[PDB]
Design an enzyme around this catalytic site. Structure first.
Site, mmCIF file in Angstrom:
data_model
loop_
_atom_site.group_PDB
_atom_site.id
_atom_site.type_symbol
_atom_site.label_atom_id
_atom_site.label_comp_id
_atom_site.label_asym_id
_atom_site.label_seq_id
_atom_site.Cartn_x
_atom_site.Cartn_y
_atom_site.Cartn_z
ATOM 1 N N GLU B 254 -4.205 4.614 24.353
ATOM 2 C CA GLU B 254 -3.803 3.337 24.943
ATOM 3 C C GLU B 254 -5.058 2.700 25.559
ATOM 4 O OE1 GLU B 254 -2.169 5.220 29.113
ATOM 5 O OE2 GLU B 254 -0.596 4.549 27.735
ATOM 6 N N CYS B 255 -5.856 2.051 24.717
ATOM 7 C CA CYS B 255 -7.151 1.496 25.111
ATOM 8 C C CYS B 255 -7.083 -0.009 25.327
ATOM 9 C CB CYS B 255 -8.194 1.785 24.040
ATOM 10 S SG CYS B 255 -8.604 3.541 23.922
ATOM 11 N N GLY B 256 -7.794 -0.484 26.342
ATOM 12 C CA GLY B 256 -7.926 -1.908 26.616
ATOM 13 C C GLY B 256 -9.377 -2.330 26.483
ATOM 14 N N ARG B 257 -10.197 -1.846 27.416
ATOM 15 C CA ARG B 257 -11.581 -2.279 27.563
ATOM 16 C C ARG B 257 -12.366 -2.171 26.268
ATOM 17 N NH1 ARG B 257 -13.930 -2.903 32.395
ATOM 18 N NH2 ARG B 257 -12.485 -1.345 33.251
ATOM 19 N N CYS B 332 -17.049 -21.323 47.856
ATOM 20 C CA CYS B 332 -17.621 -21.434 49.199
ATOM 21 C C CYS B 332 -17.838 -20.112 49.930
ATOM 22 C CB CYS B 332 -16.774 -22.381 50.034
ATOM 23 S SG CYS B 332 -16.901 -24.046 49.386
ATOM 24 N N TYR B 361 -10.980 -7.459 31.197
ATOM 25 C CA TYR B 361 -10.943 -7.553 32.672
ATOM 26 C C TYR B 361 -11.896 -8.639 33.156
ATOM 27 C CZ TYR B 361 -8.651 -3.079 31.847
ATOM 28 O OH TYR B 361 -7.836 -2.083 31.357
#
Lengths: 382, 383
Positions: B254-257, B332, B361
């Site tokens: 289950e990979c995202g990055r 700011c 991300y």
């Protein structure tokens, strides 16, 4: 607990899950009345809406303040819902041509100019629109930050501004300090501002019409009973104005945090309590993507526990007593922490955590849509 | 620069301001093709959409992956737009009753249960609905985090799960490692997962049908040439499966990055260049509320500079060269920093900074509406 308890009780009675911002608008009004009426006749309070720009908050605040301080085209538009452009003041280190043209078109009161290049970009728009603009020069007095004009460079920018016929130089903007809790130190900083402004005015012989004294009036999240001594500050501020002969100079503050922090609450139910390798965790509805303040500031946010007496399940609640407990949200990151290893006397699944002083830089700084959770609900008490 | 340059040139020629996320979908497809075709027949890749759940990204990814890993009702709903429920797997430490009921109603493939109390709440819903659910138990192997069931508590939750007729226990879920760039270490972690799953399966006398091996395959932001050795990992992973007799156990990652990082860019024009108390700053359009990754990870994000020769104003640009420079956005706060004191060869107002490796991300973790700035434009390249 007194303010939020009736709201929480009603949500529980209606079988409504608890993940809410609750705002005390009566307390906000009383706080503003006190702050603004205490100021001398030459001083104004602007609300820095970056702290909280929710429409209902701005609606409530608008009556009591001179205007809004804004730092984008979006904040200008939000401010224009309740104030004329002539009571909006615009700061920031990266004002785009689009924002400057919008500001000039609408008739914003002042632009707080942060560089020679911004001055030139603004001036080109004014020459193109055939308009004039009142400005302050934002000064960075002698640590290195991106904000304002380095003290040494201010003379040259003053001279440039004075020869531009489309620019009206009203004075200076100082916003050096963040979250100061010491009222006497704040008076000493304002004294520095006064002296620097007078010295530049006297050197270049232009009228010192106005000084923006910035914000930086602090809120204490570590000890809630030791807040900024506003009445002490104001009394000594008044004395300083007379001592420094500033009665004919108009002054403004631009406060966000101090105006709205204490009247907001982030309230959320306990979904789970678990022990992992000896450490106790309580998992809450929502998360630091709805209330990022504790993570951004790396602190344990103040809270109380509403102990709910009923049980909606046929199995027992999970309960602990007198443990170091870490409060986390629903997110799949170990950074989702509201408070780390804090004492909790009693907590059970189904209880509600009431995070206090959540009104400023709570929702406004948060990454609302990370992991695509539904937003919390907002309740405004009148 | 080859990929984004024509987009930047078009924006400049059209006098459109530059503040954009740009994604290379062709590159994404080739990456996914490689990953999914390399895996053994008993292992599937799921995309962990928290890394980037933009609909165009999900649509592209859905053509190659087995399914989506999701962690909220919003992610379930997004997943369902591009995959059927029986290819969606649902994890997270605080699944609400509403989320559990939604997942069950839609018929999600698996729920990755993280505690005894969640198991009991899920079971109460299943008994109420007259439905069943395949689950994994998420295990936290012996650092304290909030995730999963502590290793010493797993025995009790297995026994509770096996006695519940509405629960089908398929096996275990392990996701304990984060941003690992070492392929051989990753094989050794999977080895540990295999042995733990088998020990519990044998001890508790139930068939081990499935293991979710998690994500945590890393991306290198400091040295872009030194990425995770995927082919080396897969070769040794395949050998490990045979070695440990896991050929009849289905597996997923289950990979995202790792799937989306390198194909995204955050691109922004220089609005101002100034010196303050000896230090040089370049102020960029947008900010870390659009691309929070450099701040969250407290690093200097990799970038390149596109020079624009033209001057749209009647007064001069600000130009510097060979200066240590801090890149900041429009916000700011002094925390609005993309990179601190980085040597810049040459830069002027009006030039464009291209932040590389912005796909994972980046937008997804950012506080988009802080200070109410307009969102960046999103460009997805298909050619």
């Amino acid at each position: 607990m007194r303010i939020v308890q009736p709201v929480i009780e009603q949500l529980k009675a209606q079988s409504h899950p608890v993940c809410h911002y609750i705002y005390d608008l009566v307390g906000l009004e009383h706080h503003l009345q006190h702050i603004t009426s205490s100021l001398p006749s030459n001083c104004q309070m602007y609300y820095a809406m970056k702290a909280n720009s929710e429409r209902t908050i701005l609606d409530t605040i608008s009556q009591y303040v001179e205007g809004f301080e804004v730092a984008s085209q979006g904040e200008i538009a939000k401010g224009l819902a309740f104030k004329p452009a002539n009571h909006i003041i615009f700061g920031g280190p990266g004002k785009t041509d689009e924002e400057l043209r919008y500001a000039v078109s609408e008739g914003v009161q002042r632009i707080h100019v942060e560089s020679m290049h911004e001055l030139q970009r603004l001036n080109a728009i004014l020459e193109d629109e055939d308009k004039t603009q009142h400005i302050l020069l934002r000064v960075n007095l002698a640590r290195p930050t991106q904000f304002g004009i380095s003290e040494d460079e201010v003379d040259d920018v003053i001279e440039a501004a004075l020869v531009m016929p489309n620019i009206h130089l009203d004075g200076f903007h100082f916003h050096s300090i963040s979250n100061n809790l010491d009222s006497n130190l704040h008076v000493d900083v304002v004294k520095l501002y006064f002296k620097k402004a007078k010295s530049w005015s006297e050197k270049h012989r232009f009228p010192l019409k106005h000084i923006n004294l910035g914000g930086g009036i602090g809120v204490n999240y570590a000890d809630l009973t030791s807040q900024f001594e506003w009445d002490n500050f104001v009394e000594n501020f008044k004395t300083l104005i007379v001592e420094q002969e500033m009665e004919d100079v108009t002054l403004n503050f631009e406060c966000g945090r101090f105006i709205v922090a204490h009247i907001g609450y982030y309230v959320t139910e306990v979904l789970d309590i678990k022990k992992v390798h000896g450490a106790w965790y309580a998992i809450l509805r929502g998360g630091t993507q709805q209330f990022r303040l504790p993570v951004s500031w790396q602190h344990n946010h103040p809270f109380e526990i509403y102990r709910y007496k009923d049980n909606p399940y046929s199995f027992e609640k999970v309960s602990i007593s007198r443990q170091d407990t870490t409060l986390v949200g629903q997110l799949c990151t170990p950074k989702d922490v509201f408070a780390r290893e804090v004492q909790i006397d009693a907590i059970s699944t189904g209880d509600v955590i009431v995070f206090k002083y959540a009104g400023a830089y709570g929702w406004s700084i948060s990454h609302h849509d990370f992991l695509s959770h539904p937003h919390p609900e907002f309740i405004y008490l009148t």
